[PDB]
Design a protein around this ligand. Structure first.
Ligand SMILES: O[C@@H]1[C@@H](O)[C@H](O[C@@H]2CCNC[C@H]2O)OC[C@H]1O
Length: 312
């Protein structure tokens, strides 16, 4: 193959990227987007703050641009994300009780309905658990609504879009730990009772040199619960600036991740959280860290590129 897209296509899997619609006007950016991936997800365009800035007042412009791009270039469309504690507007945080639950249900319904027939899969709920096990402790949904908001969100999502794959997504759940176990119990519960749930997303925002050795094992146990699995926000950050050894390790790490997916028949594919290090979210969140993507700030393919192709 000559592109990661062909390599992924050939393996009967998806290889996507997190898109920023504004960057499409940058031809280099769009050139790589057009030919290196077969799936696209909105990095921010479909989140609550970008879609419902005022109560029951939606702005689908950016989200629609992302959907149009996927349809125009023949890529699968992945929705991110309907319920998340972060990037939630103040108006919603100022609500509580039935008023808040109402706002959440309305958000899920309206956004799912708007993209019905376009978005193939949805991260209905994102980052619901806590490192160390149990539910997230700094979430407006967990605090104001309790354990049941997850189930409520999925059922409402299914009520709105009866065919889309409904997923739950999270990070630090790549390996088998207290966090992935709490997630596991939830998914098992849902499938046991018929709560609509079709997939589980493993963000995979890893650190160079630290890829969970039981990633494959973990993906398989979830897949065996009767649900699809997917690497959704892959990037492997390092201390900047990069050098040959760091880039070599990063490459091996990308290979380990993609191979873990290739080894689980129900692993739909791998989505990297961005195209170029030039725009990666890492530097601003993890000062001193970066160079986490497949293409560097000058759009040159990094060693990670070859590793991804051989892993597929
Ligand atoms: O631009 C940044 C995004 O990349 C970031 O996306 C999150 C990364 C962590 N996993 C959940 C994703 O939505 O969100 C913050 C934004 O500033």
């Amino acid at each position: 193959a000559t592109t990661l897209k062909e390599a992924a296509d050939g393996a009967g899997r998806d290889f996507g990227f997190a898109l920023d619609p504004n960057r499409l006007s940058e031809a280099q950016y769009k050139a790589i987007a057009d030919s290196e991936f077969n799936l696209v997800v909105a990095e921010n365009a479909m989140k609550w703050d970008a879609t419902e800035p005022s109560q029951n007042s939606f702005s689908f412009g950016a989200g629609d641009r992302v959907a149009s791009y996927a349809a125009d270039t023949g890529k699968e469309l992945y929705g991110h994300t309907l319920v998340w504690h972060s990037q939630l507007p103040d108006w919603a945080k100022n609500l509580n009780g039935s008023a808040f639950e109402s706002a959440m249900v309305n958000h899920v319904t309206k956004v799912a309905d708007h993209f019905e027939g376009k978005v193939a899969s949805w991260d209905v709920v994102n980052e619901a658990f806590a490192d160390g096990g149990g539910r997230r402790q700094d979430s407006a949904f967990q605090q104001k609504l309790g354990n049941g908001y997850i189930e409520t969100a999925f059922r409402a999502a299914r009520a709105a879009d009866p065919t889309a794959k409904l997923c739950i997504n999270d990070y630090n759940v790549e390996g088998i730990n207290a966090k992935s176990n709490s997630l596991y119990d939830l998914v098992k519960d849902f499938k046991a009772r018929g709560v609509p749930l079709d997939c589980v997303g493993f963000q995979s925002h890893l650190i160079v040199g630290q890829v969970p050795g039981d990633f494959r094992q973990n993906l398989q146990r979830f897949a065996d619960l009767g649900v699809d699995v997917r690497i959704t926000e892959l990037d492997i950050r390092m201390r900047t600036p990069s050098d040959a050894t760091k880039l070599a390790t990063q490459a091996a790490d990308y290979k380990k991740v993609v191979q873990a997916c290739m080894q689980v028949t129900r692993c739909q594919g791998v989505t990297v959280w961005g195209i170029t290090d030039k725009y990666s979210w890492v530097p601003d969140v993890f000062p001193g860290e970066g160079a986490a993507l497949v293409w560097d700030a000058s759009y040159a393919k990094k060693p990670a590129y070859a590793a991804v192709m051989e892993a597929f």
